[PDB]
Design a protein around this ligand. Sequence first.
Ligand SMILES: Nc1ncnc2c1ncn2[C@@H]1O[C@H](COP(=O)(O)OP(=O)(O)OP(=O)(O)O)[C@@H](O)[C@H]1O
Ligand SMILES: [Mn+2]
Ligand SMILES: [Mn+2]
Length: 281
Amino acid sequence: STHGFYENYEPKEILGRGVSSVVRRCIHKPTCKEYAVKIIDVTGGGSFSAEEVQELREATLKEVDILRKVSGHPNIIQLKDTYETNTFFFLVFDLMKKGELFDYLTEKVTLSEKETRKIMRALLEVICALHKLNIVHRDLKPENILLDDDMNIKLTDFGFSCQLDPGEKLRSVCGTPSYLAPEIIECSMNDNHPGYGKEVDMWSTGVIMYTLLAGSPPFWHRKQMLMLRMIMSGNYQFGSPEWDDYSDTVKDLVSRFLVVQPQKRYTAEEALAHPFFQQYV
Ligand SMILES: Nc1ncnc2c1ncn2[C@@H]1O[C@H](COP(=O)(O)OP(=O)(O)OP(=O)(O)O)[C@@H](O)[C@H]1O
Ligand SMILES: [Mn+2]
Ligand SMILES: [Mn+2]
């Protein structure tokens, strides 16, 4: 499969990395077309522990299977090819040439209300289609939303995703602590807690919507545990110079993702019916 991979593609420059991966631009030899390959080291560079190797191999098998499930959506990355050797996995994808939403937010500082509107509608439609399949992404954040050549977003990174059976609940904690829903944190501090569902994605959506308009996240503290209490209490504001220029309509939408009790939180469908997206009914 390594021969298979290097037999069919010429590897190019690094585009990004993760704890146990490297993503590169690569050229398909037969077509001369360009792709992005995510290279996952299941061994972890000679340092994990046999058990973990099989936790990482079944992790990426879960990832590939979630990707085959969501294929075809216009705003979701397309897995085009996969190769598997004893240590490495190779996921071949369409090449997103305008990088991350993160990188784009870094250079613009903040995004206007109309640009945020366009991005958020595209993401909510994505999330809506995931949730109908009962898929929870669990890593929604600006680094995992990419931009193609016309600046339309492409949801990517399904490495923590899962399909749920009817009424099932999750318990493991994964994802970036600034984007983590409260019920996840709660769950990590109580064995008796019910577990969390699809709604964690609607919290993250809230932190992303907020952050594109403010240029900074709604819940931060240099000391993690105090940041987590802020999140668990849902203690944030539309403040200082930061929110002065925006409508009341956007802020109302945001505050409806940013609700602690999951039951009371907006769903992807509720968010698309808000007045904020109804200008042209
Ligand atoms: N299809 C792609 N087109 C262009 N660049 C990409 C593509 N896929 C990934 N990259 C880049 O590589 C980075 C890492 O990709 P990905 O999120 O899929 O890796 P990961 O190891 O799962 O990351 P994480 O630490 O968030 O778990 C992305 O955030 C992006 O910069
Ligand atoms: Mn990622
Ligand atoms: Mn990931």
